[PDB]
Swiss-Prot record, chains A, B:
It comes from the Bacteria. It is found in: Secreted. Homotetramer. Its main location: secreted. GO terms for cellular component: extracellular region. Biotin binds at residues 33, 44, 82, 98, 110. This is Streptavidin. GO terms for molecular function: biotin binding. A motif (Cell attachment site) lies at residues 49-51. Keywords: Biotin, Secreted, Signal.
Length: 124, 124, 122, 122
C-alpha cells in the first residue's frame, strides 16, 4: 500500500477524539476509535477500506471506516461512517465527512441521521 | 447477534446494485458489493459494523459499511460509506444514506464528496 | 419551468410544499411538515435554474424553511437541495439538511441529513 | 440577530457572502464563489430564526444560490444550512448540498456535500 505507512498510527480530530488505525496492504483498515463526545470502556472497534494505489497526480487517498457504538461496556444503538481522504506530507491530514445513524422506529427514521465533518491530524 | 440471521445474505438497492454481506456475532460486517452504476471484475470488498444488540423497542439496527472502489481489475480512486439501519419483518429493508469521496488535489477537495441514499431489499 | 414548479407538492411523509416560481429564479411559498393548519405553516424562500439544460436534465433548485412562525419557534432551519423533473410523473427529488441552534459543545450533533421526494399527488 | 448577521462574510475558500437579514426572518443578498466581479455574483435568498434561544445557542439559518446570473448558467443550486454564533470571533458554521441538473441515469451522482465556515475577516 502506497500510504500504508502514512495512514497506520494514531490520529486526533478537532473534538480531541482519537482514531488508532492499521492499514493493510490489501486496502483493509482496522483499529479502535475513542470519541471525546457522546479508556477501554470508551474504545470501539473500527473497520474500513482505503485505496492502496492512489493516482500519483497529487490526489489524496480515498478511504472510509465505520464504528458501531457498542463495546463490552456500553451500547448507544448507533453507527458512524467517515468518508474522506488521507493527504500525506509535513501536515498529514485525514479530511472526512461523516454520517451518524441511530436505531429508530419507522416514524422517527426522518430524524435518524446526523451529518458532520472531522479533520484528523497526527498531533492533538 | 439479534439480527445476525436477518442481515446475512444478498440485498438489492433501487439502482439494481447487489450487496452480499455476512454479519458476525461480534458486530462485524464483511462481504462484497457490485454497483449497477459507475461479475468478479465488478465485485469489491466491503467491511463494516452493526449493533449486535439493538433496543427491543421496535427500533431498527444501526449499521454502516465501506467499499473502496479498487479490486484486482480496476481502481476508481474512491470510497463509499453507507450509514443506516436494518428493519426486519416481511418487507425487511436496509435504509441508508451514503458518502462517496474521490481522491482529489487540495484545490478540488470542495468537489470531492457525493451524498445519496440507497434502500436495500431482499428481492430485486 | 416556472409552470411545472408552481403549485402544490407532497412528500413521502405527507408534508405539503406550496411554491410559486418567479421568472427571475425566485421560490416563495409555505411548507407544512407532517412531522416535528396556519399554526403548522412556515414561510419558504429559495431559487431554481430558470433556464435548465434542454437535454432531459432536471432543473436544479433549493429552498429554506426556518421553523419559526407566529405560533411556534423550533430554533432550526431546513434546506432542501435537488431537482425538478417534469412529465406525467413530475417530481422534486431532494436531499435536505436540518440544523438546530446549539451551544458550541453540542454543535457536532447540530445537523440532520435526509431526503424527500415531492409528487403532485400525495 | 439581524445586526450580527447583516453584512459581509468570507469562507475558507475565499468566497464572499453579502447578506441582509430582515426582521421577518428573510435572508437576501449575493454570493461570489472563489471556485467553480458582477459576472461572478449570484442572488441568494434564505431564512434565519429571528428569535433565537437566549441560552448561548447559535441562530439556525439557511440560504440557496442557483448558479445562474445574466452571464453564466451552471444548471446547479447550493443550499447552506447552519448557525450564526456572535461574539468577538463571530461565525456562520454551515454544511451545504450542491445539486446539478442531471438525467435520471446520472441522478445518483447529482449532489455534492461539504461544509463552509464564514468569518467577518477573510
Amino acid at each position: 500500500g502506497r500510504d500504508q505507512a502514512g495512514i497506520t498510527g494514531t490520529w486526533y480530530n478537532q473534538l480531541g477524539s482519537t482514531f488508532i488505525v492499521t492499514a493493510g496492504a490489501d486496502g483493509a483498515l482496522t483499529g479502535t476509535y475513542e470519541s471525546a463526545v457522546s479508556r477501554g470502556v470508551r474504545k470501539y472497534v473500527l473497520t474500513g477500506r482505503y485505496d492502496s494505489a492512489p493516482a500519483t497526480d497529487g490526489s489524496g487517498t480515498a478511504l472510509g471506516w465505520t464504528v458501531a457504538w457498542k463495546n463490552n461496556y456500553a451500547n448507544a444503538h448507533s453507527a458512524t461512517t467517515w468518508s474522506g481522504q488521507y493527504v500525506g506530507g509535513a501536515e498529514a491530514r485525514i479530511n472526512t465527512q461523516w454520517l451518524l445513524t441511530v436505531g429508530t422506529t419507522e416514524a422517527n427514521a426522518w430524524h435518524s441521521t446526523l451529518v458532520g465533518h472531522d479533520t484528523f491530524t497526527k498531533v492533538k
